[PDB]
Amino acid sequence: SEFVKPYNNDPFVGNLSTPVTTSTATKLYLGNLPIYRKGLSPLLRGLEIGMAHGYFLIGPFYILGPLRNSPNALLVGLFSAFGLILILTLGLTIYGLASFQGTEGGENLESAKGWRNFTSGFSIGAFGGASVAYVLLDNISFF
Amino acid sequence: SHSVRVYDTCIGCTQCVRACPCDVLEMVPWDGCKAGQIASAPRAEDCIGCKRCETACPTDFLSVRVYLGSETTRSLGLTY
Amino acid sequence: WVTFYWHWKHLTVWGGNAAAFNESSTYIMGWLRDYLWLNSSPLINGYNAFGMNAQAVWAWMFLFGHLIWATGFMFLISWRGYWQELIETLVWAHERTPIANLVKWRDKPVALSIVQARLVGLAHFTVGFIFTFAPFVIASTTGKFA
Amino acid sequence: TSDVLNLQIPTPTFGGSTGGWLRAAEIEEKYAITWTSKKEQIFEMPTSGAAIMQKGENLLYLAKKEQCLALSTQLRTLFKISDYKIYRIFPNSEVQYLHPKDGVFPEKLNEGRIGVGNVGYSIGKNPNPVNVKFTGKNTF
Amino acid sequence: SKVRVIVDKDPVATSFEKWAQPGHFSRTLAKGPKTTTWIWNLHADAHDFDSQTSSLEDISRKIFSAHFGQLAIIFLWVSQAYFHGARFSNYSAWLLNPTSIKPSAQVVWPVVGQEILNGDVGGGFSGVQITSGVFQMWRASGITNETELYWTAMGGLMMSALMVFAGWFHYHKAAPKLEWFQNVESMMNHHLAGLLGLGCLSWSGHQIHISLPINKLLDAGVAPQEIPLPHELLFNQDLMAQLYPSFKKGLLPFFTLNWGEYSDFLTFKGGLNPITGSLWLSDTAHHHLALAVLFIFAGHMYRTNWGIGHSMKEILEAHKGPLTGEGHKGLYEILTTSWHAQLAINLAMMGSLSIIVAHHMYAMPPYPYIAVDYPTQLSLFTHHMWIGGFCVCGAAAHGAIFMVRDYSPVQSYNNLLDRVLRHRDAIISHLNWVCIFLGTHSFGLYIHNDTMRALGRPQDMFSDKAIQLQPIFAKWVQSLHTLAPGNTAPNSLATASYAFGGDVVAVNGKIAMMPIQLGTADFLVHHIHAFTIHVTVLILLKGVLFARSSRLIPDKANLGFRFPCDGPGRGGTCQVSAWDHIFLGLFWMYNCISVVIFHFSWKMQSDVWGTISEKGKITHITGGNFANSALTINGWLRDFLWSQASQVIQSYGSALSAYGIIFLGAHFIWAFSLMFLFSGRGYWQELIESVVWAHNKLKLAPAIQPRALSITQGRAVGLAHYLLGGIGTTWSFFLARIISV
Amino acid sequence: QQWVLNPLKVKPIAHAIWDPHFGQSAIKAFTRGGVSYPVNIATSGVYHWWYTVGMRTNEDLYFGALGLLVLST
Amino acid sequence: IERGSKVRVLRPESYWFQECGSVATIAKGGDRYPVVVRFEKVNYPGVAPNNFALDELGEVEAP
Ligand code: CLA
Ligand code: CLA
Ligand code: CLA
Ligand code: CLA
Ligand code: CLA
Ligand SMILES: CC1=C(/C=C/C(C)=C/C=C/C(C)=C/C=C/C=C(C)/C=C/C=C(C)/C=C/C2=C(C)CCCC2(C)C)C(C)(C)CCC1
Ligand SMILES: CC1=C(C/C=C(\C)CCC[C@H](C)CCC[C@H](C)CCCC(C)C)C(=O)c2ccccc2C1=O
Ligand SMILES: CC1=C(C/C=C(\C)CCC[C@H](C)CCC[C@H](C)CCCC(C)C)C(=O)c2ccccc2C1=O
Ligand code: SF4
Ligand code: SF4
């Protein structure tokens, strides 16, 4: 048998249809993530990405930070996560400014309105996810 | 895009045209040499500047000269 | 060479030990073991496993200048072609991975040009040169007071 | 010929490579080469690998003109095919004919070509760059 | 009979005619020199037989005769060591006391004041100390007399003359045909049985009959001049039965399969001999017997004239799967029609084998009193590391040469080579990401430790008193090895080596081998090793895969294996050839091997080597400072280089002054390399023009026009000078340090 | 002020150090001179040059700084 | 000048400027550089001859 074939039935495109690129499992995974899920406004995509990312980002600052062996470890980790979230939001805004200029807007992500909605959703979601993981980490003895 | 010039010390021995990998050069009729032809560069926008023509010239201080200039997506040889 | 000569001669004169220079300056190993190896001891001991002192910043800048002088040799010895093919492979990698291929560059990434590479390697060489000689010439004189 | 390309020409049987055209071929510029074969045989692709060329007519899309001309050089110096045609496909489905332009190879003389870039003196008689200062023009 | 000897008779006439016609082997160089580039091209193309002739038969004959000449050189090199031990050494005085007499087999002539190099090595002898370990190698063979060394040297000279004659004979008298070389199954069977298994069998026989009784008597305290001669031990069952009480039964238990009666001299006790600090020689003889039986058994696999055996074409073509298309089909023709592919495999295997030898001979000292000879251990480890690194670079070089020259797309359609070439961007991209990840992590932990220690925050470091990175897998493997005797090696008395934990082995105060403890510094430096190996693999694999074509240059195979560039076009195509990739990867090999040998030297001086006193008080060479100082780059710089260069910079006026001279000279050569490595050809050509003007003015212009070195030659000269200077500096530094402490 | 009264024994000061990356022992180590804050010892010789040309107080240096600021403006 | 003459080259951008060469063939036609001069020293590409004009050769020795 042959499980590696030309990608999308074109033998001259620079990609291959390996069991990693074109499996049904990978299509179901990477067709249902927020950035690829069908029927999603850009704000909801940004929100769902942001909450997971904020949860993530408050992860490492609390445990490994300079004030880890301090009674104010979790607060300092939350503030560091907030600062990194603000930096990422600024990077998203300047990327949208440099990339999408003179665009028609709409529900497409590759436009000025779509990227502004995506950035707003990411920022509010990231701050919310950092706060939620702060609340769960402060009462970790419940579990 | 680079600029390619051919000077009148050409002998029409065609090696620059064969050495060209981008179809920049071609042979046009002429009357200033025994071969009756001189090289020409009508497609200098497809020049990449690799100077394979200048390696192939037999004349003392080569008649076909490539001057590196502005860079485009063709003269940089970018596939992406 | 000029600054090494001046610094070692004045280091021996200020300490009242000009005979050390007069005997050890005639051969290269005398320079290597009596100026550079001997006078680096207060510098490299700015911070160690037992603590640190006020010359820790000079030790850190000494290693900093070493690393910049070393990473100049990158651009000075390796030339464009290797890096252009590497950039092209990275371009394929970014264009053909999910999630991250939606982020698209405006300027096509290319390797540094030949003259630009020579300039960057030379600037690295020079900055590392200055930043590895200044901490030595300051901390060795500060670490001896003579 | 003219600026027409048959889109339904069969392609060489290739197993797919990681050397093909990237996103900036459906966006900016694409090239194709068409040639005529007498038998079914194996040729080396300019983007690595080996492909079987079909007996009859072939069509192959590449990303730059250098790849098409390197493939044409392979189709000449090896097994003799000398009727290849290289095109340039724009993203708005507009094709432009490039190689064998006037119908004959550039190394052979053809009456009807106009010399472009010819200079009527030797290379050592160019003007000094001082004489072109603050003018924008050059001494070429 | 398919496997047969077919040989041409008198193919090439022996004459001194092409000796006087340099450059005769190639078409271009035979027309005579016009510039001073024909000389360097003559030197570069001397061994490139593939570009001289298009016939594989003549190429194979040249290769065979050159192999014979190389073996002659190696036999002369063995004879030099045996003769210098016989006539110019203190081997007898070393035999009488192999713990206080320093080995020395090299004496200098007093002409210029260099007689100070004849140091006091002990035993009433003056000479240069030897770190080769040939003395312990001779003691492991029972060569207690100085006549046997002389006759071994004479036999080596005779064998070298034999190889010279064979090399002349097989190229000028009896040159085999192409069908002789392509019998790879016959060659494989004959090598596996007759070379390896019969060498193991004969060496085990020599060990059992000579080295076991002589070394047993030597460890018993008998002086070497009252030990029976090896011919008196070979045919004396009474004396061997006095030593090993199993020769009374003779060869009868061997044929009756009662091999348990031979357990007196064929053991599996393991560990180290307490008298000598080395492996038990009975274990060595038993090991060679097991290897001999295994290799002779393995040499019966491949098909020859008789119907039994395997065909290697059928084995390869049966191995194919879904994800790999046609599998290994066509590799048999590749490896039976190309010599460069066989180099690309054999050089990789030989380099990896040399590295394995380096890792195995330090933790398992195989020669008596070689563990307490620290300079010998350090020199052997560093030597085999450098040899392995050079060979593993050469493997990639010849893989690139095969890919440029001998590759054929019609032969290798849809097989493993084709599939690898069809997705090379994915391989190079993922290996690039791995290199960046490993580099950022492994080096940034060092830089973070530097910053924390410089900022006065030792509690924030990556150390054992801080955030810990314990190599738990390596410790688990060590604990598994320590508990192996009895549990998973039930018929074993001691562990395989004491580096995995156990008991300290001491020979007359000095430490032979003690357990090596792994901490966070060991984790950090092992990750450094993995990262350096990965980047070298990235450079070499990118050179091999992109040897034929790339996105930048679609017709790179038409330009050749080595070529400087393809012009300043496409933004610049500098160093696009696979040769330049090998040139760049050799630097990274140098970096990797330098870091590996630095790790070995510091860790062994800090945690293994030292002295033992009453009540087991262990005092190491540097004082156990590797655990806390190898966490920062400043710690390395201050405590390894600066602290251990004191021996090499203060060696002037003593017997080690040659090491200081070579230290300075290797620094000079390393700095001289950057002249070629940084500059370019055109400047030097214009300067040569300016010099040629003065020469022309004084009627001194050579007819062979002087030219600058070519771009590829300039890179090669710079790289060779860089490698020579670096290896010389490290060589002198290591030897002057470890001899004097 | 302190360096004028004793030039051979008082280390001249370049400026004060502000670093949130310092540990405790770095703060005590860089606290030198007559001051009580972490500080850099000047190695440019500006103290001797100003001391020769008539500067004796911090007010003189401040007025020179104002004059050069107005000149730059 | 004639065939077999020894000439000195006056072209400043030539590799053999102010160097002696031998005239090989003088073409009689519309060629701008009719005289063929062969030299004993190869240039950087390795080419021994070149085509020269009649005013770029200063003449040294008659045939
Ligand atoms: C790569 C090397 C490296 C590493 C691992 C660290 C690690 C650290 N540094 Mg550090 N540092 C480094 C180099 C490094 N340093 C260098 C080179 C310098 C000098 C310029 C410094 C200077 C420095 C200072 C001055 C300080 C630190 C500090 C710290 C600590 C906290 C930092 C933190 O939370 O960041 C934020 C971390 C994150 C946001 C995490 C991102 C990484 C995540 C885990 C990647 C996950 C990828 C994921 C697995 C992919 C798979 C996804 C898939 C499953 C879908 C931490 C132990 C602080 C300290 O006090 O230490 C105790 C501190 O004050 N660093
Ligand atoms: C059992 C038979 C046998 C043995 C022992 C060898 C041994 C060898 N072959 Mg060989 N070969 C054989 C059969 C054999 N071959 C057959 C059948 C073929 C044809 C298919 C080949 C084709 C072949 C080629 C094409 C090449 C070799 C090469 C080599 C050498 C490899 C280098 C090495 O390991 O150095 C080890 C060095 C030694 C062991 C030193 C001893 C050297 C002698 C000649 C070994 C034999 C001695 C003798 C038989 C034993 C006497 C015992 C006595 C004391 C009681 C090695 C000497 C290569 C080489 O180096 O060419 C010269 C090479 O290029 N062989
Ligand atoms: C089994 C070992 C082996 C063999 C048989 C070959 C064989 C070959 N190699 Mg190869 N190679 C090897 C190992 C080997 N190599 C290793 C280990 C490397 C990595 C460094 C390389 C890297 C390499 C490259 C990069 C190239 C070759 C090439 C070649 C071919 C021509 C070589 C030639 O004419 O050189 C003639 C021999 C010389 C010029 C002598 C070199 C002398 C060295 C540079 C100096 C040594 C200094 C010395 C050790 C110390 C001096 C001390 C000082 C104080 C005096 C030939 C087929 C070339 C080729 O075109 O292949 C087709 C080519 O481009 N090889
Ligand atoms: C000390 C000198 C030096 C340094 C630092 C490097 C660094 C590097 N070389 Mg290299 N190189 C050098 C000398 C050096 N080289 C020389 C002399 C040569 C000539 C032979 C080469 C030839 C060469 C080749 C041929 C290749 C490299 C490659 C690489 C890269 C490996 C990937 C990696 O881990 O990057 C990670 C970065 C580092 C290891 C260095 C910085 C680490 C810091 C401390 C931690 C992270 C810092 C962070 C990114 C920034 C934070 C601070 C900032 C915000 C201010 C890396 C950029 C390979 C490459 O790029 O492919 C992947 C490659 O193929 N080099
Ligand atoms: C993680 C490492 C790290 C970091 C981030 C810092 C950060 C800092 N240290 Mg520091 N330090 C460190 C490690 C570190 N240190 C270590 C290990 C030591 C040794 C103990 C010290 C010793 C030390 C001393 C002794 C001092 C500092 C000072 C400072 C501060 C300088 C800021 C400044 O003036 O900006 C200005 C920054 C620059 C001028 C550098 C940029 C140079 C660029 C490349 C030139 C080109 C710029 C270009 C035009 C682009 C700019 C765009 C423009 C629009 C801005 C800053 C807070 C100083 C301080 O207190 O300052 C108030 C000071 O006196 N540190
Ligand atoms: C050191 C050296 C040397 C020397 C060497 C030698 C001395 C060698 C020897 C060698 C030898 C001396 C070898 C031997 C071998 C033997 C063998 C290898 C045998 C075998 C046997 C067998 C195999 C048997 C079999 C059998 C059986 C068991 C059963 C059946 C029957 C029979 C009996 C057949 C020289 C001088 C060269 C050089 C330098 C180095
Ligand atoms: C490493 C290396 C590269 C690769 C280096 C590259 C591609 C540039 C690296 C840039 C660094 C990573 C900074 C990137 C810029 C930052 C993202 C900041 C952006 C600034 C803009 C917004 C202005 C070459 O291109 C090269 C070319 C010729 C000879 C030698 C070499 C060489 O050694
Ligand atoms: C110096 C230099 C030259 C000029 C080097 C030349 C012309 C080499 C000259 C070789 C000489 C003639 C060999 C013998 C050297 C001395 C005559 C002997 C010295 C002996 C010592 C051991 C004392 C290049 O051609 C070049 C090309 C490309 C990159 C870098 C460089 C480069 O750096
Ligand atoms: S190679 Fe040079 S001389 Fe020959 S035809 Fe072309 S331009 Fe003219
Ligand atoms: S520079 Fe290259 S592409 Fe341009 S004309 Fe010359 S050879 Fe052709």
UniProtKB/Swiss-Prot annotation, chain A:
Keywords: Chloroplast, Membrane, Photosynthesis, Photosystem I, Plastid, Thylakoid, Transmembrane, Transmembrane helix. The keyword Transferase does not apply. Pfam families: PsaL. Disulfide bonds: none annotated. Its main location: plastid. It is a multi-pass membrane protein. It is found in: Plastid, Chloroplast thylakoid membrane. The chain crosses the membrane at residues 47-67, 74-94, 124-143. GO terms for cellular component: chloroplast thylakoid membrane; photosystem I reaction center. GO terms for biological process: photosynthesis. HAMAP family: PSI_PsaL. Belongs to the PsaL family. This is Photosystem I reaction center subunit XI. It comes from Emiliania huxleyi (Coccolithophore). The lineage of its organism: Eukaryota, Haptista, Haptophyta, Prymnesiophyceae, Isochrysidales.
From Swiss-Prot, chain B:
GO terms for biological process: photosynthetic electron transport in photosystem I. It is a peripheral membrane protein. It catalyses: reduced [plastocyanin] + hnu + oxidized [2Fe-2S]-[ferredoxin] = oxidized [plastocyanin] + reduced [2Fe-2S]-[ferredoxin]. [4Fe-4S] cluster 1 binds at residues 10, 13, 16, 57. Keywords: 4Fe-4S, Chloroplast, Electron transport, Iron, Iron-sulfur, Membrane, Metal-binding, Oxidoreductase, Photosynthesis, Photosystem I, Plastid, Repeat, Thylakoid, Transport. Gene3D superfamilies: 3.30.70.20. GO terms for cellular component: chloroplast thylakoid membrane; photosystem I. It comes from the Eukaryota. Binds 2 [4Fe-4S] clusters. Cluster 2 is most probably the spectroscopically characterized electron acceptor FA and cluster 1 is most probably FB. Apoprotein for the two 4Fe-4S centers FA and FB of photosystem I (PSI); essential for photochemical activity. FB is the terminal electron acceptor of PSI, donating electrons to ferredoxin. The C-terminus interacts with PsaA/B/D and helps assemble the protein into the PSI complex. Required for binding of PsaD and PsaE to PSI. PSI is a plastocyanin/cytochrome c6-ferredoxin oxidoreductase, converting photonic excitation into a charge separation, which transfers an electron from the donor P700 chlorophyll pair to the spectroscopically characterized acceptors A0, A1, FX, FA and FB in turn. The eukaryotic PSI reaction center is composed of at least 11 subunits.
UniProtKB/Swiss-Prot annotation, chain C:
The chain crosses the membrane at residues 55-77, 119-139. Chlorophyll a B1 binds at residue 66. Phylloquinone binds at residue 83. Chlorophyll a B3 binds at residues 74, 82. It is found in: Plastid, Chloroplast thylakoid membrane. PsaA and PsaB bind P700, the primary electron donor of photosystem I (PSI), as well as the electron acceptors A0, A1 and FX. PSI is a plastocyanin/cytochrome c6-ferredoxin oxidoreductase, converting photonic excitation into a charge separation, which transfers an electron from the donor P700 chlorophyll pair to the spectroscopically characterized acceptors A0, A1, FX, FA and FB in turn. Oxidized P700 is reduced on the lumenal side of the thylakoid membrane by plastocyanin or cytochrome c6. The PsaA/B heterodimer binds the P700 chlorophyll special pair and subsequent electron acceptors. PSI consists of a core antenna complex that captures photons, and an electron transfer chain that converts photonic excitation into a charge separation. The eukaryotic PSI reaction center is composed of at least 11 subunits. This is Photosystem I P700 chlorophyll a apoprotein A2. It comes from Emiliania huxleyi. The chain holds residues 589 to 734 of 734 of the full protein.
UniProtKB/Swiss-Prot annotation, chain E:
P700 is a chlorophyll a/chlorophyll a' dimer, A0 is one or more chlorophyll a, A1 is one or both phylloquinones and FX is a shared 4Fe-4S iron-sulfur center. The keyword Protein biosynthesis does not apply. [4Fe-4S] cluster binds at residues 565, 574. Chlorophyll a binds at residues 675, 683. Its EC number is 1.97.1.12. GO terms for biological process: photosynthesis. The chain crosses the membrane at residues 63-86, 149-172, 188-212, 284-302, 339-362, 378-404, 426-448, 523-541, 581-602, 656-678, 716-736. InterPro entries: PSI_PsaA, PSI_PsaA/B, PSI_PsaA/B_CS, PSI_PsaA/B_sf. Phylloquinone binds at residue 684. Belongs to the PsaA/PsaB family. This is Photosystem I P700 chlorophyll a apoprotein A1. The gene is psaA.
